[PDB]
TrEMBL record:
EC number from the UniProt entry: 3.2.1.51
Domain of life from the UniProt record: Bacteria
Organism: Bacteroides thetaiotaomicron (strain ATCC 29148 / DSM 2079 / JCM 5827 / CCUG 10774 / NCTC 10582 / VPI-5482 / E50)
Designated name of the protein: alpha-L-fucosidase
GO MF annotation list: alpha-L-fucosidase activity
A Gene Ontology biological process term: fucose metabolic process
Length: 459
């Protein structure tokens, strides 16, 4: 069989990559303040009062959108806790909501379980509320957070992601996070950790340097762990990563479907269009990353219908786009073929476990797909066998109509990364043959999938 090349993903990282999309839910005391996205920790707990909370309605939105996981803000930097923790009074325990007898996190994980969605927790490292205590020290806070982490990792079922926002967290040192890490890893062994700054040695996935929904081109799963730590001076190290990076810590791309992270009625006219979301999908999922897309629940405790509709149409457009691989039915010829078991046709078979592979030592390959009828396409996708590491580092796609003139596709010329998935949109071409050029790499190519497609009219 093939041996892996360089650093490889863990089982958690594979599971995570396979989600492709994750939902964020920013919900809390901010929602009940007027135009606030970052709370000071001084709002009265009494104002938290969703009129008819319905997390099931959130899950129905995610079903409609094709999204298999969700992360809730159990506590944002304002420090207000959405579950009745035994370790603070600054929580739903003292809200007007349900006379202080509610538990949003409970309703969230119960709804996730009922709909078969993976649940995840955002629990803010920087806590502005705790900072207001004249008795605050980093060491006491470390124990405070650990107790709360212990509640959320013990009493709320299986947790698939823990999110550590690096905003305001520079005071928190590595031994602090180590303590937190052991609790998470021991109680929830499958839980992916989104690690920032001083949490770097414990991170399963990294930030990619912006909140616009654009991972780098290229975007390597690998990078130097120091890039995560010294976040502010390594934008490209996070956004693009490094082929010779010392750690396998792939990029998770986060973006709100609205201008703000929290809900504001004024932004109902500002929800990202289906086309914007499609661009974002292509610059995240389509760039060897994973898209974490925020839907902020409102004061009733519902997801707004424009947010729902646009996410649902994105899903519809994706399904139509990629339902027919227009290369299927082709006659396939390739140089550098490891064997029949790894024939280039495996790129076209829609099977989970098969792939095209080259011969050891040989990093280049040329694969020509000759089509029964001339086709028209404006999109292409390629997927590497990531269990075997980043192998190919330069690739291009070409076509011809007359059989003699190979024409380049400008958008798909001298690309570098493949990884989990790379998507390229291009001006519409007609073609009788399509050539896939694997031009360079660290090891022989190993490719699960290759296809060309016609983008949905929805886009
Ligand atoms: C400048 C702001 C984006 S702060 C930024 O937020 C990111 C999440 O989007 C990560 O949590 C970073 O660690 C944090 O510094």
């Amino acid at each position: 069989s093939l041996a892996p090349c360089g650093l490889v993903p863990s089982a958690r990282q594979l599971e995570w990559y396979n989600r492709e999309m994750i939902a964020f839910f920013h919900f809390g005391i901010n929602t009940f303040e007027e135009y606030v996205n970052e709370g000071d920790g001084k709002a009265s707990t009494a104002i938290f009062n969703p009129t008819a909370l319905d997390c099931r309605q959130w899950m129905q939105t995610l079903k409609a959108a094709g999204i298999p996981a969700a992360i809730l803000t159990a506590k944002h930097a304002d420090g207000f806790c959405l579950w009745p923790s035994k370790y603070t009074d600054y929580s739903v325990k003292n809200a007007a909501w349900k006379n202080g007898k509610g538990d949003v996190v409970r309703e969230f994980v119960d709804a996730c379980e009922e709909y078969g969605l993976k649940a995840g927790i955002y629990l803010g490292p920087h806590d502005r509320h705790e900072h207001l205590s004249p008795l605050y020290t980093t060491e006491r806070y470390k124990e405070y957070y650990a107790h709360q982490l212990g509640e959320l990792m013990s009493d709320y079922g299986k947790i698939w992601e823990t999110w550590w926002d690096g905003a305001g967290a520079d005071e928190l040192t590595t031994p602090v996070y180590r303590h937190w890490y052991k609790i998470v890893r021991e109680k929830q062994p499958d839980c992916v950790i989104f690690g920032t700054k001083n949490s770097y040695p414990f991170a399963d996935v990294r930030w990619m340097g912006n909140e616009a929904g654009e991972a780098g081109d290229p975007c390597w799963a690998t990078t130097d762990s120091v890039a995560i730590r010294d976040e502010a001076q390594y934008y490209k190290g996070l956004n693009e990563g490094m082929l010779d990076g010392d750690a396998y810590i792939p990029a998770e791309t986060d973006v709100s479907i609205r201008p703000s992270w929290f809900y504001h009625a004024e932004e109902d006219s500002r929800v990202k269009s289906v086309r914007e979301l499609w661009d974002i999908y292509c610059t995240s999922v389509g760039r060897n990353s994973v898209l974490l897309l925020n839907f902020p629940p409102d004061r009733r405790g519902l997801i707004h219908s424009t947010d729902s509709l646009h996410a649902a149409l994105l899903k519809q457009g994706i399904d139509e786009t990629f339902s027919t691989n227009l290369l299927r039915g082709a006659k396939v010829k390739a140089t550098n073929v490891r064997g029949a078991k790894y024939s280039p046709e495996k790129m076209l078979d829609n099977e989970k476990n098969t792939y095209f592979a080259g011969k050891d030592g040989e990093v280049k390959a040329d694969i020509i797909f000759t089509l029964p009828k001339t086709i028209e396409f404006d999109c292409l996708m390629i997927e590497e066998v990531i269990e075997l590491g980043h192998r190919t580092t330069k690739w291009s796609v070409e076509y011809t109509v007359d059989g003699k003139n190979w024409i380049t596709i400008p958008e798909a010329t001298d690309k570098q990364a493949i990884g989990h998935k790379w998507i390229v949109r291009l001006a519409p071409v007609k073609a009788k043959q399509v050539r896939l050029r694997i031009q360079d790499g660290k090891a022989c190519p190993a490719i699960h999938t290759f296809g060309v497609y016609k983008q949905s009219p929805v886009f």
